[PDB]
Design a protein around this ligand. Structure first.
Ligand SMILES: Cc1cc2nc3c(=O)[nH]c(=O)nc-3n(C[C@H](O)[C@H](O)[C@H](O)COP(=O)(O)O)c2cc1C
Ligand code: F3S
Lengths: 1472, 81
């Protein structure tokens, strides 16, 4: 993957531009996806200006005359198969180009060579042709461009009207032209020989090569698009299309006029995210705005809440945020209007983008540095890009523009500072509220009756209601959930329980919510939805609210402010309406609102206060959905707004799922009354109502921010109405009609069961005389509660069976488990074979099947070391595979003791934290593991309480004892698919023995990501469920995240079979596997290996107390204090007996079924038959969308390849062939090489050889050194061991020093470069990720997210950007330059030595956990002096030498940053 | 190539109708498209009445209750990819 742009400053055409463009494109073959056929690609495109002279000469050759004005060429893909459609397309384009007055010059068939493209990509190759037209009316150029664009759009619409598919238009303009296709990005100039002539010379050029997930290519889906390029993916595209449909009707401009009517459906059909972004961008720029203004309005800079920018830019950003909803997502944009060329980043700056200026007036930019070969002495500036920045080139006068100058020129054009104060905030109205109007809070009996009307039990009002008002945050869970799904339940479940939240796997990186809170917002705007193309003051007159949720007092204040334009609507329906009262009520409301909005009302306030004994409350979610979707389909939602009052929402999930429907605000007036009645009963103590309400509001805000960051969105303005949810158990019609766009994999109950349950609950609440709330069990088991999974009798029977070692007791346990009513999905099927029963003495052995099951990872931090080692040895004793999980592991357990038992694990994990990841830790296993997203709590990192980190676990995780460890949810290394491929290559390079696996959690559309990772050479995919365990997590995350692994696994199997990819990767499932029946079912669905998990822990003595998060497990398993540890009763024989019994049961059921071996059943979906629950439930769950399958063909239904998938080798291989004496006699060496950018992960296989021969610290420093010249590739020196010195002359690409383990890497420019060192970038983003030991010396500026998660390493650089030293844990960093904004976010260990002249540090620091001061102790003075001395004597920077020279007056300019919780542990008191 | 039809004069169903229909289809192979491939053709099919009892057996097996009145069956071709 890659995107880049070249341009000339002045603007004179020259062949060198396209020459360097094609050359740089020819070197993007290392980031691609090379396959076995080697010919098929996944899309590549180039984009230049029109070569007028060539077409003029050609048309002179034909026989016409070349006019004085410029020409315009239109390039099109026409159907190739049938000769009946090409005539139609020619007819259409000619009819619609001759209807305006222009003169056709003729057609032309571009010469091509189809010999290099593969076969599968050739089966859908369309016919490429071009037409030539010319301005003859003497009209200006801008009118020419506008008219051609309108003609092109009209042709597209007219041809779409005839259903004549397989037709596309590349680009129709007189300034730009596009050559794109599905070939390989290297052989472009061979497919298009036109680019080989000496006349195609342009002022600018764009090149792009994408990385597609699936394998089926479609030509019209190749980048660049019309007037835009892109990299990555946009998270918030679902709500963007809906808001665009809303804005379509309230826009017009005289530039279009009558033909404006021809452009109503702005966003077409059947495109990716970049396609919609491109169409909107084009239709906006054709109105008069330039490129930078449109970029600032579409993807606005992250609005920082500080004074780091002049206020004019702040007013401009406020206006742009008000006028158009942002577009989040990782993106590196290179947009090219016919006048400007702007390269910019997104809000967060998640992807790299580096540019170089030559001394010839030539600017180049892209994702890498050494793609195009540049001379070393002709470089003027090597620059990078941070968040929200943008660099611009103006060809109209030949002028460059960096960030500040460009934005200042932009904000010069209009008086932005005077339009912002026209609006007002809410606090002004709150502060003037007269102290009056106290509503008499309803009686306790009334409140209890209304609460029973929605089944809100009492455990809710004290488990997740008391902490939210008392502490100021949400509750904490301790284990997976075993309550059935919302449809299979029996009690009245709220409608929100049928909605599962979404997240993002490797396709989209989630963003943390505890560090980068400055880049997120919850602003709501009332009275802003309107025109988008015009400019006036009628768009800055509105009201702004800071939070989408409101209390009662503020809501009444707003209602009093809105005056005589607010229309109320009753959301209650008469219970005696009849069998179909709900449909009548919904029709009535969805008609009444459309009536009221046209009468003169601009606000709709949906209320439900009219609930009475004869009228029940319509579910607010469904009513809001219907009303919003009707206002959207009726072209009215823009005209009004929507404020909702509820009576059933209490937790953070309800407000989120209700906002995700389309409502603007949400008010809950029951929770406040319950809080008041609980406060006046003197329960919180002496906390007044105001402070409690404030803490409650803050907790709700935190919850909304967490749930909004769980997906990758930054601003609520794009999430409202986005419909980022999954529905299970709802009918296809109801969801597909009342809700905008939510995929329901299985149809479910309609409007009969819902109304039935609602009326039954209303009757059991109001019609009877109730006085006390029921106890209820949803978070902890009770006798009057629903059916949980782990029942007391079940646990006791299993424990007696595993202790007595009795097969009959285990059989009785399995029977007891199977004889329950339906609880999960696997309770709705039934095995059904057709063959004759085979005697049990003919199926395979017990050990041969035992060698499949494994036990998942368990963090050393959550568990006690005793149970850890016990499970480890119990799995390693028989020969099966075990796990280790995160949290590292003790090194002393690498070799067996005298007794003959190995405490080492067989599988190591690579989580987002990378705590115990050193060189030695990654070479003592036979299988690696990537923890992309955890099962029980996806979209979140591993959590651990503050007092659970003892001395041992801290010395193991390389952390300061006594801190609440929160691993970052983002991965900081997998931002897209190609980065995942790079990490896979790194892991396969460091360990030439084992394999690497990836973990996932089930959701809709996971098959695409599966087929994507299947092209990344990965060979084992572990698909988790949503019923697994954890150490600690919020209950909202446990109960409301993921889907049962049935749909996910059954869809991954289908997808991986559909692209001939099943035969290359294994498949392993886990999550909720208890007995043999479920194991056989999972194997039937298409799995090979399995897991046990919590079940095994029950054999270990776990009693499901669900108090593991307090380090007080009574049986002594999840404990880190020495007192409870001595209560352990674990014994590996228990696990051996458990596995033996499970294998015996599976053998017996398979023998009875009719087969002989498991490897002859995988994929046989036809052996199951769905059985109905009957007519007692009237639900319509049809599981057929899972039982489906595609015939495999010739390959096997399972993996049929032994050994790992080989990957190509880089230069380091040839290095090993030269370093014989170091591995035969051990003598020093000193090598030199000319390294290039297409060599990834240099210096890792040598590191593996060293650590297998000698170890980590077995050598002296600087034993072997390598001098590389020229720029280096990605992931330089990843996992270097102490003794190796990599000296590179030039600059590193990305991820340098990832996981440094004692080595030494130095980067310095070529000594013959006339560049000032401290004024140029020399490293990419994400430097020294996961570093634990070593020294790094730079000679330039650093990228972004610098030295994150450092543990014990030292680093010296000459500058940094945003999020520097984020979540650092230990080591030493010295930055000599300008630090970025939000520095040292969450730093709880180590130090920072900053050098800043203009006193800008107190403005950028994140003064939360760290303190900054002057240097006061002579010891640290000498330490810093010696560090700078080592730097200057190692890399010889002029700036460091000058600093070293004048030392008397420079230390008083240095500042020191030190964490707070480390003041009382430093042996040297930093104070006096 | 060709089209044929078999009907019952009285109007009482029987297996012999479908049997003879398949028998007829098994004898128009020569007038079709023969090529060196040996597998592909140019399309064929048959059209019969709804065997109510078979779908009744299916819907009884699935767990529902067989309705007395007549069922209606629908055959749909969805995009596979
Ligand atoms: C006590 C416990 C700790 C766990 N710790 C982790 C962990 O640190 N990282 C991780 O990815 N999964 C962790 N898991 C989840 C397991 O990988 C796996 O999903 C779980 O064993 C399946 O649960 P089940 O037995 O209910 O099917 C943990 C599970 C449990 C029960
Ligand atoms: S909840 Fe955890 S602490 Fe022990 S008793 Fe059960 S495994």
């Amino acid at each position: 993957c890659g995107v880049g742009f070249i341009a000339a400053i002045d603007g004179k055409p020259r062949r060198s531009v396209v020459e360097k463009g094609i050359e740089a494109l020819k070197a993007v073959w290392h980031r691609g996806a090379v396959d076995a056929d080697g010919k098929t690609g996944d899309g590549a495109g180039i984009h230049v200006a029109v070569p007028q002279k060539f077409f003029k000469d050609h048309v002179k050759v034909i026989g016409h005359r070349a006019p004085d004005n410029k020409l315009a060429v239109g390039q099109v893909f026409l159907p190739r198969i049938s000769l009946d459609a090409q005539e139609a397309c020619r007819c259409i384009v000619e009819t619609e180009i001759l209807a305006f007055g222009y003169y056709i010059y003729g057609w032309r068939q571009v010469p091509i060579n189809v010999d290099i493209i593969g076969e599968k990509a050739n089966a859908t190759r369309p016919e490429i042709e071009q037409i030539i037209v010319g301005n003859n009316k003497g009209v200006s150029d801008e009118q020419f461009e506008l008219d051609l664009y309108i003609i092109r759009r009209r042709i597209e619409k007219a041809v779409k009207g005839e259903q004549i598919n397989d037709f596309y238009i590349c680009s129709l303009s007189a300034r730009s032209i596009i050559y794109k296709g599905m070939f390989l990005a290297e052989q472009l100039t061979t497919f298009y020989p036109d680019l080989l002539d000496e006349r195609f010379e342009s002022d600018f050029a764009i090149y792009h090569q994408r990385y597609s997930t699936n394998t089926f290519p479609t030509w019209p889906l190749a980048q660049p698009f019309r007037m835009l390029a892109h990299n990555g993916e946009i998270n918030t595209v679902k709500g963007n299309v809906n808001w665009m449909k809303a804005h379509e009707t309230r826009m017009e401009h005289p530039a279009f006029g009558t033909h404006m009517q021809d452009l109503k459906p702005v966003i077409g059909v059947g495109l990716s995210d970049s396609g919609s972004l491109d169409t909107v961008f084009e239709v906006m720029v054709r109105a008069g705005r330039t490129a930078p203004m449109v970029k600032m309005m579409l993807v606005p800079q992250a609005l920082t809440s500080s004074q780091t920018t002049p206020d004019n830019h702040k007013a401009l950003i406020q206006y742009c945020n008000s006028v158009m909803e942002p577009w989040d997502g990782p993106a590196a944009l290179a947009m090219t209007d016919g006048r400007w060329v702007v390269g910019g980043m997104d809000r967060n700056g998640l992807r790299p983008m580096r540019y170089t200026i030559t001394t010839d007036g030539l600017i180049i930019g892209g994702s890498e540095t050494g793609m195009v070969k540049i001379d070393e002495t002709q470089v003027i500036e090597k620059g990078r890009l941070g968040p929200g920045e943008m660099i611009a080139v103006d060809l109209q006068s030949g002028k460059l523009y960096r960030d500040r100058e460009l934005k200042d020129h932009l904000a010069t054009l209009k008086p932005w500072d005077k339009w912002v104060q026209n609006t007002t905030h809410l606090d002004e109205l709150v502060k003037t509220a007269s102290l009056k109007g106290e509503p008499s809070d309803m009686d306790k009996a009334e409140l209890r009756r209304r609460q029973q009307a929605f089944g809100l039990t009492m455990e809710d009002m004290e488990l997740i209601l008391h902490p939210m008002v008392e502490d100021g945050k949400e509750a904490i869970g301790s284990m997976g959930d075993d309550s059935p799904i919302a449809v299979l339940s029996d009690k009245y479940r709220g409608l929100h329980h049928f909605f599962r939240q979404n997240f993002s796997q490797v396709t989209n990186p989630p963003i943390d919510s505890l560090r980068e809170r400055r880049v997120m917002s919850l602003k709501t705007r009332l009275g802003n939805l309107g025109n988008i193309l015009d400019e006036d003051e009628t768009q800055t007159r509105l009201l702004q609210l800071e939070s989408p949720v409101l209390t009662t007092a503020e809501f009444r204040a707003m209602r009093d402010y809105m005056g005589d334009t607010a229309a109320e609507i009753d959301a209650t329906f008469p219970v005696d309406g009849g069998p179909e009262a709900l449909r009548d009520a919904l029709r009535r409301i969805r008609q009444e609102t459309e009536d009221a909005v046209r009468g003169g009302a601009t606000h709709v306030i949906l209320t439900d206060e009219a609930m009475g004994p004869a009228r029940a409350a319509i579910p607010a979610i469904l009513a809001t959905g219907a009303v919003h979707t009707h206002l959207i389909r009726s072209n009215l939602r823009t005209f009004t707004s929507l404020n909702v009052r509820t009576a059933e929402g209490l937790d953070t999930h309800y407000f989120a799922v209700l906002i995700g429907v389309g409502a603007t605000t949400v008010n809950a007036y029951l929770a406040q009354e319950a809080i008041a009645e609980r406060h006046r009963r003197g329960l919180f103590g002496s906390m007044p109502l105001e402070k409690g309400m404030a803490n409650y509001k803050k907790a709700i805000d935190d919850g909304l921010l967490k749930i909004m960051s769980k997906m990758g969105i930054s601003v609520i303005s794009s999430y409202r109405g986005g419909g980022n949810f999954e529905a299970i158990g709802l009918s296809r019609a109801l969801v597909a009609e009342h809700f905008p766009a939510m995929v329901s994999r299985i149809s479910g109950i309609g409007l009969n069961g819902i109304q039935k349950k609602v009326l039954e609950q209303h009757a059991t609440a109001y019609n009877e005389e109730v006085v006390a709330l029921p106890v209820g069990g949803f978070y902890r088991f009770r006798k009057s509660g629903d059916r949980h999974g782990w029942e007391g009798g079940v646990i006791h029977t299993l424990q007696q069976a595993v202790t007595n070692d009795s097969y009959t007791t285990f059989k009785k346990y399995s029977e007891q488990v199977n004889k329950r009513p339906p609880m999960q999905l696997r309770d709705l099927l039934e095995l059904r074979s057709t063959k004759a029963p085979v005697p049990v003495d003919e199926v395979e052995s017990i050990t041969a099947i035992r060698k499949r099951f494994i036990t998942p990872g368990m963090s050393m931090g959550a568990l006690s070391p005793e149970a850890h080692g016990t499970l480890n040895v119990a799995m390693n004793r028989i020969g099966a595979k075990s796990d280790s999980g995160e949290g590292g592991e003790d090194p002393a357990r690498f070799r067996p003791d005298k007794n003959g038992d190995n405490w080492n694990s067989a599988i190591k994990q690579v989580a987002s934290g990378r705590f115990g990841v050193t060189a030695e830790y990654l070479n003592q296993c036979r299988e690696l593991e990537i923890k992309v997203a955890q099962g029980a709590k996806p979209g979140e990192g591993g959590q651990l309480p503050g007092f659970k980190v003892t001395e041992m676990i801290a010395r193991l995780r390389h952390s300061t004892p006594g801190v609440m460890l929160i691993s970052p949810p983002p991965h900081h290394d997998i931002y897209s698919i190609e980065d995942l491929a790079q990490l896979i290559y790194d892991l396969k390079q460091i360990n030439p023995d084992a394999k690497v696996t990836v973990k996932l959690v089930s959701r809709s559309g996971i098959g695409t990501i599966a087929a994507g990772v299947a092209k990344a050479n990965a060979d084992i995919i572990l698909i988790s469920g949503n019923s697994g365990g954890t150490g600690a997590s919020p209950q909202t995350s446990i109960k409301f995240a993921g889907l049962p692994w049935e749909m996910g696994l059954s869809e991954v199997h289908q997808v991986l079979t559909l692209n001939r990819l099943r035969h290359r990767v294994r498949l392993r499932t886990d999550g909720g596997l208890k007995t043999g029946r479920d194991i056989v079912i999972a194997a039937m669905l298409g799995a090979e290996e399995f897991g046990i998990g919590t079940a095994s822990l029950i054999a270990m003595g776990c009693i499901m107390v669900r108090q593991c998060h307090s380090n007080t497990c009574p049986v002594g398993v999840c404990v880190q204090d020495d007192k409870l540890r001595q209560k352990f009763v674990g014994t590996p024989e228990k696990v051996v007996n458990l596995f033996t019994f499970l294998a015996e049961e599976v053998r017996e059921i398979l023998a009875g079924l009719g087969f002989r071996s498991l490897n002859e059943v995988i994929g046989r979906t036809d052996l199951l038959h769905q059985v109905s629950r009957g007519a007692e439930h009237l639900d319509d769950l049809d599981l057929n969308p899972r039982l489906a399958q595609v015939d495999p063909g010739e390959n096997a239904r399972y993996c049929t390849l032994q050994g790992r998938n080989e990957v190509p080798d880089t230069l380091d291989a040839r290095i090993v062939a030269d370093a014989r004496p170091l591995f035969e006699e051990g003598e020093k060496m000193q090598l030199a090489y000319n390294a290039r950018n297409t060599q990834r992960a240099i210096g890792t296989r040598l590191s593996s050889m060293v650590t297998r021969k000698f170890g980590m610290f077995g050598l002296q420093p600087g034993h072997i050194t390598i001098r590389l010249r020229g720029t280096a590739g990605q992931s330089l020196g990843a996992f270097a061991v102490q003794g190796i010195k990599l000296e590179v002359m030039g600059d590193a690409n990305d991820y340098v020093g990832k996981g440094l383990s004692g080595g030494t890497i130095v980067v310095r420019p070529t000594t013959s470069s006339p560049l000032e060192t401290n004024k140029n970038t020399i490293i990419g983003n994400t430097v020294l990720y996961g570093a634990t030991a070593g020294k790094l010396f730079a000679a330039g500026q650093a990228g972004e997210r610098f030295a994150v998660r450092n543990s014990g390493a030292t680093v010296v650089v000459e500058g940094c950007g945003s999020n520097g030293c984020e979540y650092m844990t230990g080591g030493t960093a010295v930055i000599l330059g300008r630090v970025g904004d939000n520095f040292a976010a969450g730093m709880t260990g180590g130090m920072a030595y900053v050098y800043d002249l203009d006193d800008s540090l107190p403005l950028y620091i994140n003064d939360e956990s760290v303190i900054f001061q002057r240097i006061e102790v002579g010891h640290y003075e000498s330490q810093l002096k010696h560090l700078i001395e080592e730097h200057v004597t190692e890399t010889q920077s002029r700036f460091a030498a000058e600093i070293l020279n004048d030392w008397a007056r420079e230390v008083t300019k240095f500042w020191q940053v030190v964490p707070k919780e480390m003041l009382n542990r430093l042996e040297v008191p930093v104070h006096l």
